[PDB]
From a paper:
Citrate synthase (CS, EC 2.3.3.1), an enzyme involved in the TCA cycle, catalyzes the condensation of oxaloacetate and acetyl-coenzyme-A (CoA) to form citrate and CoA. Thermoacidophilic archaeon [name] strain 7, which grows optimally at 75°C and pH 3, has two genes encoding two distinct isozymes of hypothetic CS. One of them encoded by an open reading frame (ORF) ST1805 is termed ST1805-CS, and the other, encoded by the ORF ST0587, is termed ST0587-CS.
ST1805-CS is related closely to CS from the same genus Sulfolobus solfataricus (SS-CS), and they share 68% amino acid sequence identity. ST1805-CS crystallized in a monoclinic crystal belonging to P21 that diffracted X-rays up to 2.0 Å resolution. The final model is comprised of 376 amino acid residues per subunit (two residues in the N-terminus are disordered), 341 water molecules, a glycerol molecule, and a sulfate ion. In the hinge region in subunit A of ST1805-CS, a glycerol molecule interacts with two glycine residues (Gly220, Gly 221) and interacts with His219 with a sulfate ion. His184, His259, Arg268, Arg339, and Arg359′, which are important residues for substrate binding, are exposed to the inner surface of the open cleft. In ST1805-CS, three arginine-glutamate pairs Arg370-Glu56′, Glu368-Arg30′, and Arg356-Glu10′ are formed, of which the new β-strand made across both termini from each subunit lies between the former two pairs and the latter one. In ST1805-CS, an ion pair network was comprised of three residues; Asp109 in GI loop and Asp202 in LM loop were salt-bridged with Lys215′ in M′N′ loop of neighboring subunit.
Residue numbers in the entry:
A (entry chain B), B (entry chain A): 3 to 378
Amino acid sequence: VEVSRGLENVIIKTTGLTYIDGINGILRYRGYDINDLVNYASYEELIHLMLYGELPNRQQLNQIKGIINESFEVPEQVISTIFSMPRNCDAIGMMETAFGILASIYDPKWNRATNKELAVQIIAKTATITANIYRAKEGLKPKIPEPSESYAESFLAATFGKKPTQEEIKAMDASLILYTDHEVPASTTAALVASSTLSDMYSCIVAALAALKGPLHGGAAEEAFKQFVEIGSVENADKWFEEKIIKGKSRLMGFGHRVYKTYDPRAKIFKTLAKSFAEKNENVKKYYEIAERIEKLGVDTFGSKHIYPNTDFYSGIVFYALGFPIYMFTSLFALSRVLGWLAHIIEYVEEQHRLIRPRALYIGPEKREFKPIELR
Amino acid sequence: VEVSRGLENVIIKTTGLTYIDGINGILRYRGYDINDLVNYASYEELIHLMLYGELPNRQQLNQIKGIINESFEVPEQVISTIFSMPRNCDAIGMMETAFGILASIYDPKWNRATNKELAVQIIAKTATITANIYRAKEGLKPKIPEPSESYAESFLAATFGKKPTQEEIKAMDASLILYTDHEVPASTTAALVASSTLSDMYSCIVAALAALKGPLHGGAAEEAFKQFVEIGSVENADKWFEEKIIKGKSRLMGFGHRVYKTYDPRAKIFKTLAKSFAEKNENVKKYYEIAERIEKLGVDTFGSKHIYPNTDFYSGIVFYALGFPIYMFTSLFALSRVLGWLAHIIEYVEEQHRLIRPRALYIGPEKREFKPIELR
């Protein structure tokens, strides 16, 4: 059948946002190397870059921060609902629920004059919701993010109930930049489908989150890090890799091959972040050194011309090093990638709008005569 | 660059479920004409047809009813959250939120031994949720649906707190059949996109609902019906048509279709339902007679361009006759179409599964060197 499997070849839209050069292994947001953005900019500046199109001057940057800092509070029903949930609920399930309530209560209209500012407001509230989903699942009380010197600091402070170190803040800021956008996976796709009907911006995120909740999209950092936990020690790495992978059959996690020819540039930066925490904390070093050895084995026994660690291979270690339990890892992706979701759907609605409605190909039965039940 | 915008020519899957002949105006579910199903069957029989593939015998039909009747309960979090939201919230907002809570608390695994039975349970709870959304918005007390001789009766009784008449039960059962499936609109697309990541069934419905909440997909029954409310009386119909439609060149809502080039077979059946209610109720008759006259002017004007009454033209008058306020019309569509959503994602996951990841075409800025903030 002439089905577009996985929509693999299908260009669902154009974008001015993000460009992957898989051959040279370089990733750019709006023309800027992600290495420069991480090294010399910040999540707030990237927010302005993706939504408005250029890096912000001081005054524009201060306008971004001002919106964020006045936008952390969410409706009481969001918080009460989050904290009434059973504490073992999937964090993405809680997030999609939270965003349904945001939709129902704010129910923003689409409008060129305000879409960008709305997106910055949503980004603020995504921090509030993520931080308190952790706190809920831990059986703590709620804590709304408060204005501080950075978005990343405001988020971490609310999450953990104390002032983060400067190293923590920088790593978190880096992580928000690192996962802001890349390809058009099912979540971004779901968001675009919702935006094509002009469903409100919050509900477009609901759709994205609903797709991300699936284990073939969500869950990657979790599964990769769980390898290192199982291995337990660097001394154990070589045996584990032998009797699980080589004479095994179901394979290792956290390696890619499809997008980049040699190495994912994001993956490279997560590794450097992990490594930096490792020379400060023994438990982080233990997982980092395990990870390193598996990397060598995995690239050797599979060819370097082929595979590389993807972002998921070291991201969990950074997340762990920041204090986050494994059950938050996918949520920390969502916290970052929501910028890309927002930038993409605004791009679509304002510049390329078209209702999405694909075909099904009917097979299955030809016309038949109705048959009463006694005769069935 | 006029790429695959809208995905209109993309085949996203095959289906055994629904056949449409737009030339002769024929709709079939698994080979059976929609007229036979409405006239001689029931929603429970259609549930079994769509999910299991055939009309059920008495034993199989009793199994469907047994699952339904034991599955109306929802987590108390659902009630708590629904009833805590502002009474003016959009019903699909409230529904997408409710389904986020179900996904969080049930979090069902995909399993081909249980997927179909889980679908029936979800259909049970959709009635509970839709009934209580009505109740919340009217500041009424929650009420869970109870076992009864039929799904339509159980839904109607919970909603209005009163035993429905046999005509009401029959009209509701017909409605559930009539809107069960058709083409692959944005809601069905969003559910498929989520199912492609193996996101849990409830979250796949979450996704559908987020797409449905947009006014370019949801809201069609409401807008068509509101024409008649605005017309006010049958005597005013000709004046209104000439002013709004002929001179104002506005679109006649409830007319036209991408595939039907004759009368929507669904519109014929809704009309006959409306007709019957009209002869026993004066308020319904008022709107029916208005709708009749508009239909005549509409056909005279547009018939020659193969533009005819579609399924949304008469549906709202039916929902009105059943006692439903206008703000519930699209929810009642969701209540029916969920069978189609579920049938489609089960087909996809069990028989056609492929992770979905379309492409974006990069235009936008060439590579450029970082620019410190003082130079911006």
